[PDB]
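Handout, section 4.2: multi-component inputs.
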Amino acid sequence: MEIILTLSQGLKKYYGKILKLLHLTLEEDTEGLLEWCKRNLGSNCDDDFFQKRIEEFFITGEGYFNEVLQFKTPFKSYFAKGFLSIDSGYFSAKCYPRSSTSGLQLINVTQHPARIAETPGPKTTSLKTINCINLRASVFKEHREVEINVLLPQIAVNLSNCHVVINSHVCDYSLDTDGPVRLPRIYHEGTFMPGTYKIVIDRKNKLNDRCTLVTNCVIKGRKGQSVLRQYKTEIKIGKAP
Amino acid sequence: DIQMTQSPAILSASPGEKVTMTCWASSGVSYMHWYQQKPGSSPKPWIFATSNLASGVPARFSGSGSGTSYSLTISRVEAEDAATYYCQQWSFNPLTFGAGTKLEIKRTVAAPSVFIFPPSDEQLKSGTAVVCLLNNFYPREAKVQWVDNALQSGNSQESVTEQDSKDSTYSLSSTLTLSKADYEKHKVYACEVTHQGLSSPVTKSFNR
Amino acid sequence: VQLQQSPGLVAPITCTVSSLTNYGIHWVRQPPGKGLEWLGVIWAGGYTKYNSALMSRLMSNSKSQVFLNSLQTDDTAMYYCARDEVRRDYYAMDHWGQGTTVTVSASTKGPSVFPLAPSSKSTSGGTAALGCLVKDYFPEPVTVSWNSGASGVHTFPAVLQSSGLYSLSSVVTVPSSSLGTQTYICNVNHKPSNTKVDKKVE
Ligand SMILES: *[C@@H]1O[C@H](CO)[C@@H](O[C@@H]2O[C@H](CO)[C@@H](O)[C@H](O)[C@H]2NC(C)=O)[C@H](O)[C@H]1NC(C)=O
Ligand SMILES: *[C@@H]1O[C@H](CO)[C@@H](O[C@@H]2O[C@H](CO)[C@@H](O)[C@H](O)[C@H]2NC(C)=O)[C@H](O)[C@H]1NC(C)=O
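Output:
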C-alpha cells in the first residue's frame, strides 16, 4: 500500500516534477517524493519549493550547485558549472544554468501580442522556401542534417511523425512526441521562454523520413500598412526521392 | 503487513560445508539485506543490498536472489558463524523483519565434564538454600537427575549456555533450591548425568 | 566510532551517539523470543514517521543526543538504537548500540552474590571449576566479569523463579595449585539497584 523511494528513484521523480513545471512533459510520477524529500533533503517539497529552485537555477544563478539544484557560494557534492542532466527515466534534458547573457536571450510573453492578420498561403511548401519573417532554414548536405532555427518561439511549430533534437540557450533535449514542440517556461514574476531555438533533424537516419512540420509562416504586409501576416504551411522533410 | 518468511528456521552443518538459507516476501521487493546476530549481544549488519558484504565480513559469505526470494550462502562453515540471521526489506514504509535463522555447528560428540558445588555458608545462613555443572559438551541433549538415592520432581531448575563461539560446545547448570532444614535432613547429595557421550551414566556426589 | 545507549521499569529513553545533524536515527525492539518490531525514524531535519500499529501514541540533537505512552506488557523488549547510511540502497543500519532491556510490570530486588567454591577432579592437571551464584534479582539483567577482564567464562541465562525473581550462575575453568596464587574475584553489576558486588571465591 506504501512505497519507499531510493536515492536514484527519488532524484528521478524530483527531475520529473521539475520537468513538468518546465512544461516539457505532460506526465510526471510523484509518489514517495514527499518522504524522499523529508528523508534526504530535509525540507517540504511543495510547488513553492520547486518554483523557487527553478527561479534560482535559471535566474539569480550565483556560484556552485549540487545535483538537487540548490546553490551555495548524500548531496554535499557541489560542482562548478556548465550543465545539468535532468533525467526522470522517461525523459532526459540537458539544462544550462544562467550566464551573464541569459537575460536578453529571454523574451517575456506573459501577455502575448495580438493575433496577426491572416493571409492565404500555400500548404504545399518545400524546405528551400525561406521567405518567412519567423523562420530560418539551414541544410548541411555534408553531414546530411537539417537544422530549423526559429526566431519566434511563441508561434508554435507542431511536428508530425518526426524525431528531432531541439537546441537552445536554456535547455537542449530530444523529441519524438507528435504534436506541438514543447519549450521550457520559467516562472519568475511572470513566464519566461527562450528567444530562439534550433531544431536539428538527422536526414541520414531512417527515423525522419515521413517527418512533416506544420507551422504558421509570417510574411510582411497601405493606409497604415505595417500589417503582419500569417499563413499555414506543411513543410516536409521526406527524403523519399 | 508485508510478512517476510525465512527458511529453514533451524539448520546445522558440519564445518567447511556449503550452506544456503532463503528469505521469502509476501510481495516483491527491490533488494534484500541480512543482519547477523549472535546470541546475547547486539545485532551486526552482515550483507546489504542483496549481495554486498559489510566491511570485515569474510568472502566465504555471499547473498543472491531477486523478486520475492533471496538467499544467503556460506562456502565454508566456520565455528564463529553459529548465530541467527535476519532479513528486513525496503519499499514497505511499515518496515518489517523476518523471524531469523539459527545456525548451529554440528561438531563431534563431546562428553561433559561434571562438577558439583555445595551451597556457600552465606547461602546456608540465609533463609533459603546445590549446583551441578556440565561443561563443554556436545550435543545439546543431556539428562541431569538429582538425594540419599532418591530424587524429587518439583524444583530442579535447568539453564543451558548457547553454543560456544570457538569450540561449539554447550554447558548446563542445574540448581536445586528451596530446602532450608531440608538440606540438613539428608547427608549425601549427588547428580546423575546421562548423555550419549558417556559409556555409563556418570554420578557426582559429596558428603555433608 | 560506536553508539552507546543508557535499563528500566515502566507502568501500564536516551540513545547517546558519537552527527545528529547528518543522520536519521531508528528504533528497534526485540520482544522476548528473538522477534523484532520496527518503530520509527527521526531524520536530520526533524520530520517523523511512525508505524501505524503504535496508534500515534509515541519521539523528538545539539550535543549528539537522541531521545525516545499507555504502555502494555507486550512492549517488554530489548531496545536498539540504529542509524541509516544513505546511498543507492537505503536503511543499512550498520552501527547498533547494545540495547536496553525494558520489563513492563512494582517490584525491585538487588541480587545476592554467593561463591561457588572449587575442588573437583583433576584430569591430567589443569582442571578446576569456580563460580558465583547470582540470585534474587527481579529487575532487568545482571552482568558478570572475572578479575576485571583478566576465556573459559560461561554465563548462564537467568531463570524466572516461582517467586517472580531471577537467578543465574557463571563459571570458569582454571588449574588449581595456581588458583590459590593469582586469586579470584567475580565482578557483578545490577544497574536497576545500583548494586556492584565483587566476591572472592574460596
Ligand atoms: C512581462 O510584461 C508585463 C507587461 O504588461 C510586465 O508587467 C506585469 O504585468 C502583470 C499583469 O498585469 C503584473 O501582475 C506584474 O506585476 C507586472 N510587472 C511589473 C509591474 O513589474 C511584467 O513585469 C513582465 N514580466 C516580468 C517578469 O517583468
Ligand atoms: C498546433 O497544435 C495546437 C494545439 O491543438 C493548435 O492550437 C489550436 O488551434 C485552434 C485553431 O485556432 C484552436 O481552436 C485551439 O483552441 C488550439 N488549441 C488549444 C489547446 O487551444 C495549433 O493550431 C497547431 N498548429 C497549427 C499550425 O495548426
